Amino acid sequence: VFYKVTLSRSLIGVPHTTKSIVKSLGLGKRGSIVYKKVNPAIAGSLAKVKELVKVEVTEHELTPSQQRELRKSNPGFIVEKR
Amino acid sequence: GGLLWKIPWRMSTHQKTRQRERLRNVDQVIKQLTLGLHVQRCQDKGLTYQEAMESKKKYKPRSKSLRLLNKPSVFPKENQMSSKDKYWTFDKKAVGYRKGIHKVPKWTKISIRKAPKFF
RNA sequence: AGUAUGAAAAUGAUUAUUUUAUAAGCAAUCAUGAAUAUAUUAUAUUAUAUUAAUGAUGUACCUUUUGUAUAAUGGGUCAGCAAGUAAUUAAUAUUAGUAAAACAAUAAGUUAUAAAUAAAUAGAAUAAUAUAUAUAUAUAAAAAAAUAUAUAUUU
RNA sequence: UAGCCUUUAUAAAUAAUAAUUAUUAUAUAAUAUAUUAUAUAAAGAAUGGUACAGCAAUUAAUAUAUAUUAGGGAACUGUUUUAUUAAUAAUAUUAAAUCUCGAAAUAUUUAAUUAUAUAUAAUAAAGAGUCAGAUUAUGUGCGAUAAGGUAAAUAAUCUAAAGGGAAACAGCCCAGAUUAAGAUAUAAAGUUCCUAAUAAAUAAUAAGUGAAAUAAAUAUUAAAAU
RNA sequence: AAUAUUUAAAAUCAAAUAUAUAUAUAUUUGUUAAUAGAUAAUAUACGGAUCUUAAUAAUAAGAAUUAUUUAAUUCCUUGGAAUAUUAUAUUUUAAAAUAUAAAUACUGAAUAUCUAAAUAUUAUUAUUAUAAUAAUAAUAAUAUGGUAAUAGAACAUUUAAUGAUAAUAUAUAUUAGUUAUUAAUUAAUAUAUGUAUUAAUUAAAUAGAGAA
RNA sequence: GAAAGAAUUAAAUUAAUAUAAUGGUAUAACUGUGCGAUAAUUGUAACACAAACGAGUGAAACAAGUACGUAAGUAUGGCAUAAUGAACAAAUAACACUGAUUGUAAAGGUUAUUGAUAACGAAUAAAAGUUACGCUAGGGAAGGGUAAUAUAGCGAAAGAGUAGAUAUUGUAAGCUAUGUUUGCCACCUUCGACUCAACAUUUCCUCUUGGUUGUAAAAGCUAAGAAGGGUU
Ligand SMILES: [Mg+2]
Ligand SMILES: [Mg+2]
Ligand SMILES: [Mg+2]
Ligand SMILES: [Mg+2]
Ligand SMILES: [Mg+2]
Ligand SMILES: [Mg+2]
Ligand SMILES: [Mg+2]
Ligand SMILES: [Mg+2]
Ligand SMILES: [Mg+2]
Ligand SMILES: [Mg+2]
Ligand SMILES: [Mg+2]
Ligand SMILES: [Mg+2]
Ligand SMILES: [Mg+2]
Ligand SMILES: [Mg+2]
Ligand SMILES: [Mg+2]
Ligand SMILES: [Mg+2]
Ligand SMILES: [Mg+2]
Ligand SMILES: [Mg+2]
Ligand SMILES: [Mg+2]
Ligand SMILES: [Mg+2]
Ligand SMILES: [Mg+2]
Ligand SMILES: [Mg+2]
Ligand SMILES: [Mg+2]
Ligand SMILES: [Mg+2]
Ligand SMILES: [Mg+2]
Ligand SMILES: [Mg+2]
Ligand SMILES: [Mg+2]
Ligand SMILES: [Mg+2]
Ligand SMILES: [Mg+2]
Ligand SMILES: [Mg+2]
Ligand SMILES: [Mg+2]
Ligand SMILES: [Mg+2]
Ligand SMILES: [Mg+2]
Ligand SMILES: [Mg+2]
Ligand SMILES: [Mg+2]
Ligand SMILES: [Mg+2]
Ligand SMILES: [Mg+2]
Ligand SMILES: [Mg+2]
Ligand SMILES: [Mg+2]
Ligand SMILES: [Mg+2]
Ligand SMILES: [Mg+2]
Ligand SMILES: [Mg+2]
Ligand SMILES: [Mg+2]
């Protein structure tokens, strides 16, 4: 299974050591989402930044394209040509 | 100390609610980290995701950090901490040997759960 | 300090529209009534333009400073003028020409083509990749330390 | 000059960052007191001597109708004893920047694996600027456990950082401005009005104590437990 | 009741949780309040107003202080069920019964997402004409505060080389529009000129001023 | 059962180490003894620690010779960390490297050694003061913070007070308040007199009151409310 990791809090005031831990996890700007294969190595890294992130276990992995298509809003119309 | 840093010595009721929420979120992160390890190990043994979640046996973590973070003595859960430890920290240069938690830099992010037994 | 033109600004008087005699601060931005002016498609329940009703936000600019609204320096205003340029050399990067040669031709010179040593008459596979060879210290010669040279076409 | 920044590139480049496995023990099963697999517990490979803790040796302090040596008066009546005092011995109790017999977390750091490759290191050729810093939090030297004081150590921000919050606010809590819009989540902080947003539960206060900068020894009143 | 101590979850007691599981072990949590003391100079200073509740009685108030909490309260373990509740519709006699909605509290930045646009880069496509290319447009992802400083690309003025057109034009100024706009353009108005060192590519600067 | 030997175990680094302090040392790095006087030698020194450069530290390995040891092997000074100084110009010797027309030479070069710049990365071989008569370019490269001190109060009461700590007085130590004196930090570069005063009360007088075996009366001491008027 996979971990769904969200950078809830920002890295403005965190020490550079914590910043390095987060950067090596693939997380970028605040609110970024990355799907990490569950692994004792990953669990340790998330344990050290347990505050700044929010972690939920998920069955499958969503590619970034899949996430975008799931994030698009619903236009309230179907265009009729002419 | 001419410059005025008007930081009060007590928190408002709303800061306390947020502090309790932040502690719970951290505990939930730990609870989820262990859950993934248990599910991953169970899948390795051959089980599927569903039965892994319903398995009576829950594989406890083996890493030192996660094993200790799951010990209430070392890292107590929000429902287990005392009110003093939730909102007050330990300073050895303060009257009462305690100071408001909000005075700790980056208190919102940093986690201070344990205080000396008699202080 | 030539001659013509001169709706360039600062500056003064007057007129026209709007606002202003119970309201307080970089004089603006946004929100929003009202009045006025123009409009040869205002068909209008219209569009623009001007204007301190009223509400919210708003601590001039530059220099020097850890730090300036600062009661730190400079500025009455407007117009004109006011500051990384040239010569002789050297080293790097891109492109272009030519190319184991190039510039230049009259010769001469310069650079590259062989690396070293303070210097000297020394200077690269005797049969292949450093275990070979050249130079410097040493020696009878090697080893040792440093740099350089070679695996149809010399770089 | 080094340190921190910038431009262009090199592959036989992942060498960068981050974490995990390492270790000890218990229980079950298989194999020949031992090995293997599985689960669990333990601050969990190697280095260290701070906090803590302690009085080991060193440096200091206290008390014993305890014992010995010596000093001195009295008693005895010159003897021994007594009155004692200093030292040592024994027992018990303490502390320290230059004490650590015990000892953390952080920290230094190693091989492999995994994840970051719209990412790191290293290297080659060329350019700078900087060498007056400030505050907050923590552990200290000086000061008086004074200073918006001074000197260093670690982290963050300002310096060079818009925005929200602390009335106002360089340094505090959030959160980093490509340009729009404004639907939805929101961080810190708030919801009687000024001012965008609220309803509740259980106790205490009668002092406007308090309500966004807690003023102490002590006295009075009252409340629980022994 | 009187008297003398302490104000404590260490010990004990209560409760919760993890293991062997009707019990035991281990871990965690739970132990007073008010007043006086109280202190200076332009002016009261929680930012201000102001905040403590009251039956007869209002559609309706009763901290806006301190302490521990919730998102109506309770059971299972973020979610499910039940029960006090508000509002409405139907039926019956201002009241009774059935049915439906509310259990994410709300505000909150230039945060994040969504909705569009721009530049750069990585990876895929389409149209047009080092075609392994150039221009333009699409989809996914990442980035776009910034002083000293570094690097890239453009605009205004003047001079030199090349350089049609022309009063139905050119230059300048005002006003109102257009182009993602320090610029150039459309129209109207005013003045000069039978007329661009004009468009565009190069080469040079006495090449840009609220700062001495 | 006894004698001797090899020795083992515990304690010890407090003694000793050329020299300060620290770390190490009994497997001794400490001590005694034989040989010795040798490695207190000679050309290449990779690689590391440290590090801006200059410099500094450990040292594998190749080659020549020496001392000890039967041999294995050890020795490139001292158990380790301090015991130091760049160039320039001069001086001495060795090498045979240049030799300004040629041969010599002169002079330079390589190698080894010498002398102190202690302001100790050393500006020259060689240098002290005064300025209120001064000058130029710059920076500040009484307010504010603190309250040791000062003033005042509070808590407790040793002791005076003919008697009795608390009528009055109140050692030394304790907890505070003000920023009115002397200080400290560097964010920030005129004392007195005349005239007019405004404000505070921690009240000098005037008004009310409590205590005063130390209120007989009058004068007084101490304290509470009080800033309206006055205070040469
Ligand atoms: Mg009016
Ligand atoms: Mg005015
Ligand atoms: Mg200054
Ligand atoms: Mg300011
Ligand atoms: Mg000024
Ligand atoms: Mg002014
Ligand atoms: Mg001026
Ligand atoms: Mg530099
Ligand atoms: Mg690796
Ligand atoms: Mg120490
Ligand atoms: Mg020890
Ligand atoms: Mg400095
Ligand atoms: Mg300071
Ligand atoms: Mg600066
Ligand atoms: Mg800011
Ligand atoms: Mg920053
Ligand atoms: Mg940004
Ligand atoms: Mg109050
Ligand atoms: Mg407020
Ligand atoms: Mg307990
Ligand atoms: Mg006041
Ligand atoms: Mg954004
Ligand atoms: Mg930028
Ligand atoms: Mg000019
Ligand atoms: Mg000008
Ligand atoms: Mg300008
Ligand atoms: Mg010695
Ligand atoms: Mg010693
Ligand atoms: Mg190093
Ligand atoms: Mg070096
Ligand atoms: Mg010796
Ligand atoms: Mg000299
Ligand atoms: Mg010769
Ligand atoms: Mg000659
Ligand atoms: Mg000679
Ligand atoms: Mg001198
Ligand atoms: Mg004189
Ligand atoms: Mg002062
Ligand atoms: Mg007495
Ligand atoms: Mg006294
Ligand atoms: Mg008074
Ligand atoms: Mg009288
Ligand atoms: Mg009166």
Short mmCIF file of N, CA and C (backbone and C1' of nucleotides) in Angstrom, two decimals, chain E residues 9 25 30 41 46 49 69-70 82 84 94 99 101 116 118 142 151 160 165 167 169 173 175 197 205:
data_model
loop_
_atom_site.label_atom_id
_atom_site.label_comp_id
_atom_site.label_asym_id
_atom_site.label_seq_id
_atom_site.Cartn_x
_atom_site.Cartn_y
_atom_site.Cartn_z
P A E 9 -0.16 15.83 43.59
"O5'" A E 9 -0.57 14.32 43.89
"C5'" A E 9 0.42 13.31 44.07
"C4'" A E 9 0.03 12.02 43.38
"C3'" A E 9 0.17 12.04 41.86
"O3'" A E 9 0.42 10.73 41.35
"C1'" A E 9 -2.08 11.70 42.42
P U E 25 -1.22 -6.88 40.08
"O5'" U E 25 -0.23 -6.76 38.83
"C5'" U E 25 0.98 -7.49 38.78
"C4'" U E 25 1.70 -7.29 37.47
"C3'" U E 25 2.00 -5.85 37.08
"O3'" U E 25 3.13 -5.31 37.75
"C1'" U E 25 1.09 -6.97 35.23
P G E 30 -2.95 15.29 35.94
"O5'" G E 30 -4.24 15.07 36.85
"C5'" G E 30 -5.47 15.70 36.53
"C4'" G E 30 -6.54 15.36 37.53
"C3'" G E 30 -6.20 15.63 38.98
"O3'" G E 30 -6.36 16.99 39.34
"C1'" G E 30 -7.12 13.47 38.79
P A E 41 2.23 60.13 37.48
"O5'" A E 41 2.11 61.52 36.71
"C5'" A E 41 1.15 62.48 37.13
"C4'" A E 41 1.80 63.81 37.44
"C3'" A E 41 2.75 64.34 36.38
"O3'" A E 41 2.04 64.96 35.32
"C1'" A E 41 3.71 64.61 38.52
P C E 46 -6.12 50.21 31.56
"O5'" C E 46 -5.63 49.09 30.55
"C5'" C E 46 -6.33 48.84 29.34
"C4'" C E 46 -6.76 47.40 29.24
"C3'" C E 46 -7.07 46.90 27.84
"O3'" C E 46 -5.91 46.52 27.13
"C1'" C E 46 -8.83 46.29 29.29
P A E 49 -14.20 53.25 27.67
"O5'" A E 49 -15.53 52.92 26.88
"C5'" A E 49 -16.29 53.96 26.28
"C4'" A E 49 -17.46 53.42 25.50
"C3'" A E 49 -18.50 52.66 26.30
"O3'" A E 49 -19.41 53.50 26.98
"C1'" A E 49 -17.95 51.44 24.36
P U E 69 -8.64 20.38 28.52
"O5'" U E 69 -10.14 19.91 28.28
"C5'" U E 69 -10.76 20.06 27.01
"C4'" U E 69 -12.20 19.61 27.05
"C3'" U E 69 -12.95 19.66 25.73
"O3'" U E 69 -12.68 18.56 24.89
"C1'" U E 69 -14.27 20.65 27.41
P U E 70 -12.79 18.74 23.30
"O5'" U E 70 -14.35 18.85 23.03
"C5'" U E 70 -15.23 17.80 23.40
"C4'" U E 70 -16.66 18.11 23.01
"C3'" U E 70 -16.89 18.50 21.56
"O3'" U E 70 -16.97 17.38 20.70
"C1'" U E 70 -18.06 19.99 22.99
P A E 82 -31.77 5.63 14.51
"O5'" A E 82 -31.99 5.86 16.07
"C5'" A E 82 -32.49 4.82 16.90
"C4'" A E 82 -32.20 5.09 18.36
"C3'" A E 82 -32.89 6.31 18.96
"O3'" A E 82 -34.23 6.05 19.36
"C1'" A E 82 -30.60 6.37 19.51
P A E 84 -36.92 11.49 23.66
"O5'" A E 84 -36.09 12.67 24.33
"C5'" A E 84 -36.57 14.00 24.30
"C4'" A E 84 -35.64 14.95 25.00
"C3'" A E 84 -35.86 16.43 24.72
"O3'" A E 84 -36.90 17.00 25.50
"C1'" A E 84 -33.57 15.93 24.48
P A E 94 -51.22 30.52 18.87
"O5'" A E 94 -51.54 29.45 20.01
"C5'" A E 94 -51.59 29.83 21.38
"C4'" A E 94 -52.32 28.80 22.21
"C3'" A E 94 -51.83 27.37 22.07
"O3'" A E 94 -50.71 27.09 22.89
"C1'" A E 94 -54.19 27.42 21.85
P A E 99 -43.06 9.07 11.38
"O5'" A E 99 -42.91 10.04 10.13
"C5'" A E 99 -43.27 9.60 8.83
"C4'" A E 99 -43.15 10.70 7.81
"C3'" A E 99 -41.83 11.47 7.81
"O3'" A E 99 -40.79 10.79 7.12
"C1'" A E 99 -43.63 13.00 7.74
P A E 101 -34.90 14.30 5.41
"O5'" A E 101 -34.44 15.80 5.71
"C5'" A E 101 -34.20 16.72 4.66
"C4'" A E 101 -33.83 18.08 5.19
"C3'" A E 101 -32.72 18.11 6.23
"O3'" A E 101 -31.43 18.06 5.65
"C1'" A E 101 -34.53 19.46 6.95
P A E 116 -11.17 27.43 -17.43
"O5'" A E 116 -10.11 28.59 -17.21
"C5'" A E 116 -9.21 28.96 -18.24
"C4'" A E 116 -9.10 30.45 -18.35
"C3'" A E 116 -7.77 30.98 -18.85
"O3'" A E 116 -7.66 30.93 -20.26
"C1'" A E 116 -8.41 32.17 -16.92
P A E 118 -1.52 33.13 -22.71
"O5'" A E 118 -0.32 33.82 -21.92
"C5'" A E 118 -0.02 35.19 -22.12
"C4'" A E 118 1.25 35.59 -21.42
"C3'" A E 118 2.42 34.63 -21.58
"O3'" A E 118 3.08 34.77 -22.82
"C1'" A E 118 2.24 35.32 -19.32
P U E 142 3.28 20.33 -9.77
"O5'" U E 142 4.71 20.99 -9.98
"C5'" U E 142 5.89 20.31 -9.57
"C4'" U E 142 7.13 21.08 -9.92
"C3'" U E 142 7.14 22.55 -9.55
"O3'" U E 142 7.40 22.78 -8.18
"C1'" U E 142 7.95 22.29 -11.75
P A E 151 27.89 39.48 -15.75
"O5'" A E 151 26.75 38.58 -16.41
"C5'" A E 151 26.99 37.21 -16.69
"C4'" A E 151 25.72 36.49 -17.10
"C3'" A E 151 24.94 37.11 -18.24
"O3'" A E 151 25.49 36.83 -19.51
"C1'" A E 151 23.46 36.55 -16.51
P A E 160 23.90 62.10 -40.71
"O5'" A E 160 24.76 60.79 -40.95
"C5'" A E 160 26.16 60.86 -41.16
"C4'" A E 160 26.74 59.52 -41.52
"C3'" A E 160 25.99 58.74 -42.59
"O3'" A E 160 26.31 59.18 -43.90
"C1'" A E 160 26.51 57.31 -40.79
P U E 165 8.82 57.01 -55.58
"O5'" U E 165 7.64 57.01 -54.50
"C5'" U E 165 6.55 56.12 -54.61
"C4'" U E 165 5.69 56.16 -53.37
"C3'" U E 165 5.02 57.49 -53.08
"O3'" U E 165 3.84 57.69 -53.83
"C1'" U E 165 6.03 56.67 -51.11
P A E 167 -0.52 63.37 -52.14
"O5'" A E 167 -1.27 64.23 -51.03
"C5'" A E 167 -0.57 65.25 -50.33
"C4'" A E 167 -1.50 66.26 -49.72
"C3'" A E 167 -2.27 67.12 -50.71
"O3'" A E 167 -3.54 67.48 -50.16
"C1'" A E 167 -0.85 68.49 -49.42
P A E 169 -4.12 61.60 -46.49
"O5'" A E 169 -2.55 61.77 -46.64
"C5'" A E 169 -1.76 60.78 -47.28
"C4'" A E 169 -0.30 61.16 -47.27
"C3'" A E 169 0.31 61.39 -45.89
"O3'" A E 169 0.71 60.18 -45.28
"C1'" A E 169 0.89 63.17 -47.33
P A E 173 4.80 65.93 -29.64
"O5'" A E 173 3.58 66.89 -29.31
"C5'" A E 173 3.78 68.07 -28.54
"C4'" A E 173 2.51 68.85 -28.37
"C3'" A E 173 1.32 68.08 -27.83
"O3'" A E 173 1.35 67.93 -26.42
"C1'" A E 173 0.64 69.36 -29.69
P U E 175 -4.52 65.90 -23.21
"O5'" U E 175 -5.94 65.52 -23.82
"C5'" U E 175 -7.10 66.26 -23.47
"C4'" U E 175 -8.28 65.87 -24.32
"C3'" U E 175 -8.66 64.41 -24.33
"O3'" U E 175 -9.39 64.01 -23.18
"C1'" U E 175 -8.65 65.21 -26.54
P U E 197 14.27 63.95 -41.35
"O5'" U E 197 15.25 62.72 -41.18
"C5'" U E 197 16.31 62.50 -42.11
"C4'" U E 197 16.53 61.04 -42.39
"C3'" U E 197 17.27 60.29 -41.28
"O3'" U E 197 16.92 58.90 -41.20
"C1'" U E 197 18.60 60.34 -43.24
P A E 205 31.18 53.88 -29.15
"O5'" A E 205 30.93 55.13 -28.20
"C5'" A E 205 29.61 55.58 -27.95
"C4'" A E 205 29.27 56.80 -28.78
"C3'" A E 205 28.94 58.04 -27.98
"O3'" A E 205 29.32 59.20 -28.72
"C1'" A E 205 27.02 57.35 -29.17
#
